[PDB]
Design a protein around this ligand. Structure first.
Ligand SMILES: CCCCCCCCCC(=O)O
Ligand SMILES: [K+]
Ligand SMILES: [K+]
Ligand SMILES: [K+]
Ligand SMILES: [K+]
Ligand SMILES: [K+]
Ligand code: NA
Ligand SMILES: [Zn+2]
Length: 314
């Protein structure tokens, strides 16, 4: 820790993240997690800087006591037992399986580990997470349990953390996070999103910033930068949870924004740079992204790690 000149960047990953078997043609790009992992492994083999600056951590599955402070026990139990009503499971958008549940529990564990590591090192990245469409008593939009809200509540149980700011830059409104955190004064929610993307009903975050279809780089970046700087100053958080979803990209198959890969890079560089400048721990999740070829998401997500490498210089 003090042995390192510069900052070591924990990366939290579990092989179960892409182990879920989905039908060909399923909307969800399940293999992106493994593909991103494998790219990072190649980067580490080919670069001393990548090798020296990143280290992998494996999470343990979250215990139920981590999840029921946020989620209704009856909802949780229905999912654990494989008896959630069919229409509600279809709204989540996956077939039920034991592996789905196992994966979700590990990933929730993973976002929590990312918080622990960010507190220790300043910055940590979860190679999954961002399940912002899960509410207390129901799931939706590929989200069963809301890792961001769970991790924020968990963080507040730690001595150093009295205020958490969740900054959600995935193209979709963070509706589940908004409803979960509405009554918690110590968790502030900020969402940037495309108005015409899911969900149609957008319960209020602490602050919501909506964009028109085909919004471009300059508008998006200027707004994101200035709003985030203000939110950090206003709330003085002890921890930032940052959802770096790449479904804002121009070529995303669901999102309606026109953001370039270079602007994704600048977003990430600004966000990580500001956290380091202000000495605020930042726990990142990679969030969404929709491409039929799951590998096409890899370079977009990799920009988050390229940002972290650059900020990780002494
Ligand atoms: C089986 C893994 C599913 C991961 C879900 C990631 C976030 C979905 C919602 C979004 O794109 O806004
Ligand atoms: K798979
Ligand atoms: K605390
Ligand atoms: K969002
Ligand atoms: K709140
Ligand atoms: K798009
Ligand atoms: Na709220
Ligand atoms: Zn999204």
């Amino acid at each position: 820790h003090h042995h390192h000149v510069g900052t070591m960047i924990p990366l939290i990953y579990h092989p179960i993240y892409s182990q879920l078997d989905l039908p060909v043609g399923h909307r969800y790009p399940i293999n992106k997690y493994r593909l991103l992992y494998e790219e990072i492994v190649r980067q580490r083999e080919q670069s001393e800087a990548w090798q020296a600056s990143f280290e992998f951590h494996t999470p343990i599955a979250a215990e139920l006591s981590r999840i029921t402070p946020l989620h209704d026990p009856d909802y949780v139990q229905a999912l654990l037992e494989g008896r959630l009503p069919a229409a509600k499971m279809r709204r989540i958008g996956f077939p039920w399986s034991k592996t789905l549940i196992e994966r979700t529990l590990h990933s929730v564990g993973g976002t929590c580990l990312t918080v622990e590591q960010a507190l220790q090192s300043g910055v940590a990245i979860h190679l999954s997470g961002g399940y912002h469409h899960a509410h207390a008593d129901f799931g939706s939009g590929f989200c069963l349990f809301n890792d961001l809200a769970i991790a924020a509540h968990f963080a507040l149980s730690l001595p150093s953390v009295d205020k958490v700011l969740i900054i959600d830059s995935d193209v979709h409104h963070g509706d589940g996070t908004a409803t979960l955190c509405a009554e918690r004064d110590d968790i502030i929610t900020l969402s940037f999103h495309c108005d015409k993307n899911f969900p149609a009903r957008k319960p209020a975050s602490s602050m919501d910033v909506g964009f028109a279809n085909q919004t471009g780089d300059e508008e998006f970046l200027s707004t994101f930068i200035q709003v985030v700087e203000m939110a950090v100053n206003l709330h003085r958080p002890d921890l930032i949870l940052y959802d770096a979803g790449v479904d804002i990209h121009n070529d995303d198959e669901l999102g309606y924004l026109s953001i370039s890969q270079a602007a994704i890079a600048q977003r990430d560089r600004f966000m990580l740079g500001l956290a380091k400048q202000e000495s605020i721990p930042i726990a990142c999740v990679i969030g969404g992204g929709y491409r039929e070829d799951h590998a096409a998401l890899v370079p977009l997500h990799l920009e988050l790690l390229k940002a972290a490498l650059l900020s990780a210089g002494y």
